């Protein structure tokens, strides 16, 4: 499953206008595109990327017939990204001295998508445009653009310097204050809104991001990310009732797919280094014993009991693999989140294409939701997988419904520890002033706000939408080392810290209560 | 080690009729997944069930 992405970028004079105290839009767009290319390259994704720049002095586009579609250059064709693209983005791409509209650039991007994707099969086609919307443009080709986009199945995404005192990139705050926007910018925003509505309906509004917002949203990869595989099984409620189901891994910790290979310092080759493991007895002679002369064993309280691998396999617990059986139903209040185990969460839907299984699963989910119940079930990936006991609870949304499954603990997996009570201690009991100070601190540091007469909490620091900074740090360090072999690693990028920190308003409001708490609470290190 | 966003949920002491502690008082540390820790589910038409 491959994809084609055409990145359209403005390099005009307006993009270079760096307002004091705010980074220029050109730099923010460069950072966003660099992040996208880093993710695409270092992830070893088989995705094709092309780059079109509109606003350059020259013209290097196929549509350069006469005096139309000028100041547009196809910097890179539709071929796999490499370090060359990153190097060009970083150093040898400078702002142009001419201003060009984004409509002819978008037409050029569609033409590139159509022509290049003639000898290759691509499941998805995406076009991303980074522009300021501060250039004159003509609407004569809007209808044909929309028709071509709809016919060719091409997705669209817009990135602008402004979203729909101090300013920080990815700082969970206002990037571009709404004081100074030019009229042409308003017209361009309205046109972009019209195009997005005409393409994806009302859902298209959410696809108009901002550089600062996009730097901490992972939105650029939304339309190219691959779906997880499905695990098919049969949910069993008895011995004669079965519902075909498919389970996906809704949540799973993401690790680094690429490992580190040990190489020799003098020569950077892994074939000159060999790693071997040896076994020796408990004798001064260090007698060597072959692997075939080794037997598995276990400790039995100061006594060693030999236990060969074949014997263990013969006598190990055996069960019928690939089972999803409902042990029973219990009140949801009897299952507590603190007891959740495992490292994954499963989302169970009906089978691929069948109305009967969907109806049965919907009936079960609705019954559980109405009765306030969850299903204690037995889960086993396959014959080898160790069977586990888990809880499946309904999850109903306006657009879809499913069963969320999370593993549950065993009796020996629970640790019984005793902790001294704090509410009945005469030495650690806080005073009224201390409680008031803590209450003031909590009030002054609320990450959720109440909306205007609608009773809908709004999250000010949605950490769930923040990408993992480790991957970005690793990618930036790898790129710096590749392009600068003879320099040390650079410091952590500022926007990473900005996105990893809360809004400055919270700290500003919390300054006073924190000082009050410090004065009231005496803390001294031992 | 990379940092992780977590939530400290208050946990009040609870005792049964036997007067033996079963839920110690303190904070519950819950790990909040990052954006990349999630996965995208395939689109599936929603079919309702009759009463």
């Amino acid at each position: 499953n491959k994809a084609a992405v055409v990145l359209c970028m403005d390099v005009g004079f307006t993009m270079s206008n760096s307002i004091p105290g705010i980074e220029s839009p050109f730099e923010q767009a460069k950072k966003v595109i660099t992040m996208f290319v880093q993710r695409q390259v270092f992830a070893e994704n088989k995705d094709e990327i092309a780059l079109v720049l509109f606003g350059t002095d020259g013209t290097d586009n196929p549509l350069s017939g006469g005096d139309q579609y000028q100041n547009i250059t196809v910097h890179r064709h539709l071929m796999l990204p490499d370090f060359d693209l990153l190097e060009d983005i970083e150093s040898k791409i400078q702002p142009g001295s001419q201003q060009a509209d984004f409509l002819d650039a978008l037409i050029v991007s569609m033409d590139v998508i159509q022509h290049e994707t003639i000898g290759k099969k691509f499941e998805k086609r995406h076009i991303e445009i980074f522009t300021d919307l501060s250039s004159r443009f003509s609407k004569s080709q809007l209808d044909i653009i929309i028709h071509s986009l709809k016919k060719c199945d091409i997705s669209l995404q817009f990135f602008l310097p402004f979203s729909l005192g101090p300013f920080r990139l990815g700082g969970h705050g206002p990037s571009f204050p709404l004081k100074g926007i030019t009229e042409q910018q308003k017209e361009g925003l309205e046109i972009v809104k019209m195009v997005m509505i005409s393409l994806e309906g009302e859902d298209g509004l959410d696809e108009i991001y901002s550089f600062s917002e996009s730097l901490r949203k992972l939105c650029v990869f939304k339309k190219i990310e691959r779906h997880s595989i499905h695990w098919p099984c049969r949910l069993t409620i008895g011995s004669n009732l079965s519902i075909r189901i498919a389970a996906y891994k809704s949540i799973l910790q993401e690790r680094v797919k690429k490992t580190w290979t040990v190489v020799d310092a003098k020569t950077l080759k892994k074939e000159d280094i060999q790693k071997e493991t040896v076994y020796c007895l408990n004798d001064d002679d260090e007698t060597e014993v072959l692997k075939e002369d080794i037997i598995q064993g276990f400790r039995y309280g100061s006594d060693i009991v030999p236990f060969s691998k074949v014997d263990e396999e013969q006598m190990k617990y055996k069960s019928e693999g690939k089972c999803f059986s409902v042990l029973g139903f219990c009140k949801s209040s009897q299952v507590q989140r603190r007891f959740f185990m495992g490292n994954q969460v499963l989302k169970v839907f009906a089978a691929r294409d069948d109305e009967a299984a969907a109806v049965a699963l919907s009936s079960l989910i609705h019954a559980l939701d109405d009765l306030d119940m969850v299903a204690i079930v037995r889960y086993a990936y396959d014959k080898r997988a160790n069977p586990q006991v888990g809880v499946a609870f309904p999850h109903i949304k306006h657009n879809y419904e499913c069963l969320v499954y999370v593993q549950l603990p065993f009796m020996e997996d629970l640790r019984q520890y005793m902790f001294s009570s704090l509410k009945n201690s005469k030495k650690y009991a806080p005073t009224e002033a201390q409680l008031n100070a803590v209450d003031a601190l909590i009030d002054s540091m609320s990450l959720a706000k109440k909306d205007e007469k609608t009773d809908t909490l709004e999250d000010l620091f949605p950490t769930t939408k923040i990408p993992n900074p480790r991957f970005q740090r690793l990618f930036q360090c790898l790129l710096h080392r590749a392009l600068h072999p003879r320099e040390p690693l650079p410091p952590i990028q500022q926007h990473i810290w900005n996105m990893l920190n809360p809004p400055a308003e919270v700290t500003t409001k919390s300054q006073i209560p924190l000082s009050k708490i410090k004065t009231l609470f005496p803390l001294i290190e031992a | 080690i990379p940092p992780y966003f977590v939530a400290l949920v208050p946990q009040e002491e609870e005792l049964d009729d036997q007067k033996i502690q079963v839920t110690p008082p303190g904070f519950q540390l819950v790990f909040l997944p990052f954006a990349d820790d999630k996965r995208k589910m395939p689109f599936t038409e929603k079919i309702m069930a009759t009463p």
Binding site: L327, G328, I376, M411, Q416 | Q18, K19, I20
Partner: peptide, 23 residues
Amino acid sequence: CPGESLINPGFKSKKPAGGVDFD
């Protein structure tokens, strides 16, 4: 202390695992 395992002092005696017992 009530409900204390005789085998291992300091740890409450865990009840035997019953399983699923329908009401």
